[PDB]
DNA sequence: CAAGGCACATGACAACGGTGTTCAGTGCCGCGTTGCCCGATACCCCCTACCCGTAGTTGACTGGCATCCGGGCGCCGGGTCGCC
C-alpha cells in the first residue's frame, strides 16, 4: 500500500521539525516568529508578508525587509550545516 | 671669643600644561519605518465541444445451463420411512 505511514520517513520528519525549530530558535525571537508565520511552521497555513503585518503591527514592506533578512541569515554557512542533509 | 650682619635654599604658596573626562548638543551616516508605483494573480464574464442520459427502432423469431463421480474420513445429528 501507499497510504501506510513510513517509519523512517515520518521519524526524519520530525527530526527536520525539531532542528528546524530549534534552528529559528537560533535567530531572534521576531525574525524567527514573523519566518515562522511567512512559511506557516506553527499553522498549515502561511501568511502573506501583509498577512503577517496585522498581528505584529508592521507594514507589509517593513515586514518583507525583515523576511529578506530572515533569508539572509538562515543562510549563512552557520546555520545551513544541519539542514542541507535533511533537504 | 660672642653677637650681628648678608648669601641660596627652602616650607609653604598658585597657576599654568597637558590631557582626560562630561553631559550636551547636534548631527553623520548606516539601519530601518513607511507613502507611493507598478505587476502579477485570482475571479467575474461570454462562446462552443463534448460527455452522458433518455427514448425510439414493428415480416416473423415462445424453456437453458452444464453439471457430477477415483477427497476421505469420520462423526453428528436429524430426517425418514419401514416395523410389528
Known sequence: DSEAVVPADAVSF???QEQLHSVLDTLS???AGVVSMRFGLTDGQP????????????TRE???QIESKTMSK????S?????RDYL
Open 79 to 83: 546555520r545551513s550545516q544541519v539542514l
Open 47 to 58: 501568511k502573506t508578508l501583509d498577512e503577517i503585518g496585522k498581528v505584529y503591527g508592521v
Open 14 to 16: 520530525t527530526l527536520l
Open 74 to 77: 538562515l543562510r549563512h554557512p
Open 62 to 64: 517593513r515586514i518583507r
Open 29 to 31: 525571537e521576531r525574525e
